[PDB]
Write a protein that binds this ligand. Structure first.
Ligand SMILES: NC(=O)c1ccc[n+]([C@@H]2O[C@H](COP(=O)([O-])OP(=O)(O)OC[C@H]3O[C@@H](n4cnc5c(N)ncnc54)[C@H](OP(=O)(O)O)[C@@H]3O)[C@@H](O)[C@H]2O)c1
Length: 283
């Protein structure tokens, strides 16, 4: 079973990509960050996820340096603050992102979350960037099932190419409603915080005996086990962030893992799937 995802105008991207939140904050780390991204590309991870938010442009500048001369090898995803996502301001947000990335187009551009602009106006603005050639496709982030239904209802809202939401073993709420909805509409989901921020989100995911034993039993690390879990089913593209080369190399290698039913059942007993609607986890 191929560990790829149909994503925008790309027929198949690898199901693990590269996050950039917390890159670009410190000048002393820029070279290390550039190297971690290039390592990911060198290991076949092509999707890079960033945002105008991240270090106020800084992460985008890091990405732009990392991808110099490699633009055709990568699938670039950035995001626009909702307060920019309207007729007036959208072009400037997009143009500023493109300047920092030093590329003339994005593969995907996401509404970072839903603000006060009516969705119809954001959709029209995204469609204009598509017609101009500045973005190949648009999508959204942090939209729950109700918001996705509202979007679908808008003119051209069905062109939405992805929804990026929080998903990991210890926060599975999207499995009740949102993922099935996405699955029904052939919409790929981008899973952010797929490592729960290396466990910092949920106390003891990493420090868990049965998960530690399970990873040891196949000679993988817990992080790899958690990533393979996130991408176990089609239609989900995980975007772990790694500034460490050792970590990027691990993360790419998690594309080669096949979890058994026995293993997946054990994991469900440790962190059961949701049996009701849950508010969309975000962070
Ligand atoms: N749309 C949104 O609202 C939203 C919100 C949050 C995040 N995001 C996106 O999603 C991405 C992923 O989420 P995240 O950065 O919040 O958290 P994450 O990817 O779940 O975890 C990042 C942490 O995991 C560590 N790590 C990575 N690979 C590892 C490995 N193999 N072994 C051990 N530790 C490992 C990293 O350390 P090192 O860096 O030192 O390797 C980092 O400290 C973000 O970077 C961003 O692109 C989007």
């Amino acid at each position: 079973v191929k560990k790829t995802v149909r994503f925008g105008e790309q027929a198949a991207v690898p199901a693990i990509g590269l996050g950039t939140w917390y890159m670009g904050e410190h000048a002393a780390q820029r070279q290390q960050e550039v190297a971690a991204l290039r390592a990911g590309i060198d290991h076949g991870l092509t999707v890079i996820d960033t945002a105008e938010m991240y270090a106020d442009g800084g992460a985008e500048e890091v990405v732009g340096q990392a991808i110099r001369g490699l633009r055709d090898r990568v699938v670039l995803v950035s995001k626009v603050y909702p307060w920019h996502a309207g007729k007036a301001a959208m072009h400037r947000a997009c143009e500023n992102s493109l300047r920092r990335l030093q590329t003339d187009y994005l593969d995907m551009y996401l509404l970072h979350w839903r603000g006060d602009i009516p969705l119809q106006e954001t959709v029209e603005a995204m469609e204009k960037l598509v017609a101009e050639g500045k973005i190949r496709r648009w999508g959204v982030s942090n939209l729950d099932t109700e918001d996705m239904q509202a979007l679908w209802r808008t003119a051209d809202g069905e062109h939405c190419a992805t929804n990026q939401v929080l998903y990991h073993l210890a926060s599975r709420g999207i499995e009740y409603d949102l993922l099935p909805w996405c699955q029904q509409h052939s919409l790929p989901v981008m899973a952010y915080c797929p490592l729960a921020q290396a466990g910092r989100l949920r106390d003891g995911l990493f420090q868990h005996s049965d998960i530690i034993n399970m990873a040891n039993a196949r000679g993988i690390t817990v992080a790899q086990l958690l990533l393979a879990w996130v991408i176990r089913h089609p239609g989900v593209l995980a975007i772990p962030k790694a500034a460490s080369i050792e970590h990027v190399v691990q993360n790419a290698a998690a594309l080669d893992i096949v979890l058994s039913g026995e293993e997946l059942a054990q994991l469900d007993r440790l962190y059961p799937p949701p049996q009701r609607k849950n508010r969309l986890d975000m962070v």
